[PDB]
Amino acid sequence: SQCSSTLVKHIKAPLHLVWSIVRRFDEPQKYKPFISRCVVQGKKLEVGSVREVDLKSGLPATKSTEVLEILDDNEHILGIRIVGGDHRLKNYSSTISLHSETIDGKTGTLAIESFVVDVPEGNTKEETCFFVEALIQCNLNSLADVTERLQAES
Numbered sequence: 001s002q003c004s005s006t007l008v009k010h011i012k013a014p015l016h017l018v019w020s021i022v023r024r025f026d027e028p029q030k031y032k033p034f035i036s037r038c039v040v041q042g043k044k045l046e047v048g049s050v051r052e053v054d055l056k057s058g059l060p061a062t063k064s065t066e067v068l069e070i071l072d073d074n075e076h077i078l079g080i081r082i083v084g085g086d087h088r089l090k091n092y093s094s095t096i097s098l099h100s101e102t103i104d105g106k107t108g109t110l111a112i113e114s115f116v117v118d119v120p121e122g123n124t125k126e127e128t129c130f131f132v133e134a135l136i137q138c139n140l141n142s143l144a145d146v147t148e149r150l151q152a153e154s
């Protein structure tokens with residue numbers, strides 16, 4: 001019926017720097033490398049906000065409509081739920097959380113992202129769910145790059 005997983009990333013960057021971009025429900029293309037454009041009306045960063053995401057050409061999907069479910073600026077948790085679009089993900093929801101970790105007298109961030117999604121009557125737990133891991137891992141990878149790049153500038 002459903003299928004779920006958690007992806008993890010060690011980032012060589014301070015938490016607030018990482019959170020300052022993860023917390024922009026309105027500008028996910030800062031780091032999500034498959035998004036081309038994001039539009040959000042009303043109160044931009046507030047539980048209930050809605051983004052219309054445009055995806056770069058040559059993707060299986062072209063459009064996605066997502067809703068901000070959790071935003072914890074004090075605990076560093078952003079939770080979202082995908083509600084419409086071209087893709088085959090149904091009842092997708094994910095939560096990305098951030099945690100302080102010092103590895104080598106080097107202060108950094110640990111990003112943890114869990115999702116739950118429905119699996120089409122057609123496909124399998126593996127088929128549908130591996131696709132999303134790979135995607136999220138791509139996103140987290142890019143979050144580490146973008147994040148570590150800014151660090152090197154400041």
Ligand SMILES: CC1=CC(=O)CC(C)(C)[C@@]1(O)/C=C/C(C)=C\C(=O)O
Pocket residue numbers: 032034055059060061063064082085087088089094132135136139
């Ligand atoms: C890149 C892309 C391709 C799809 O086929 C589904 C969808 C359009 C939702 C997606 O944005 C998937 C986004 C995912 C899985 C996590 C996220 O975005 O944080």
